[PDB]
Homo-oligomer: 120 residues x 2
């Protein structure tokens, strides 16, 4: 007979830990340059999220990997999307909602249109 | 200092699960992994960040490690029979055990100080 445990909190706790690492720049492995701003990340997390980042990061080897995103990607739209990849949460205002949606479109994140948003 | 009320919300209740599923897929394919674990002469590919996030032992072992190629030999306390199901728990949130391996696995979990097991019905003795 088998003993089974399925942790309901585990997946979310790991990502929380990954995000804490990102924020403190611990154990990251890529720097993304987006509109001249540097963003540290775990390539594996980004690739898990988007087929865009998979294609962009799978080949890579260079000791200190640095990847510049093209000009369609702005810092204002990207920051919240990087945060989302880790937290599963977006919380935007009128200043950035347009840019975030447009960025998500460029990065081919399928289900992030106007209609996915609710109000607090 | 945002402009406007940050009131437009989206929260995905599947996202995290989907990320760990992607990570586990990477592990099984050995694509986008970044560390080899040697446990009782057997190799396991993994992601150091993920290990450090699941385990206090791995956090302390790995936090300063910025090398690209990284191989980590675990001590004799860690056996393959004991570690197998824990690495699998780390990447799936699921732990399946039987009478045959429960002790060896629980003991290994204590050594590695694995997280997110306190809500399970396993005693740690």
């Amino acid at each position: 007979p088998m003993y089974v445990y399925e942790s309901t909190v585990h997946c979310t706790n790991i990502l929380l830990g990954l995000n804490d690492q990102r924020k403190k720049d611990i154990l990251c492995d890529v720097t993304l340059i987006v509109e001249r701003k540097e963003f540290r990340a775990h390539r594996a997390v980004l690739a898990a999220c988007s087929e865009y980042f998979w294609q962009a990061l799978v080949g890579q080897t260079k000791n200190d990997l640095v990847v510049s995103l093209p000009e369609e990607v702005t810092a204002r739209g990207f920051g919240p999307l990087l945060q989302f990849a880790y937290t599963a949460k977006l919380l935007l205002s009128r200043e950035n909602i347009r840019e975030v949606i447009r960025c998500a479109e460029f990065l081919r994140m399928h289900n992030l249109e106007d209609s996915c948003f609710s109000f607090l």
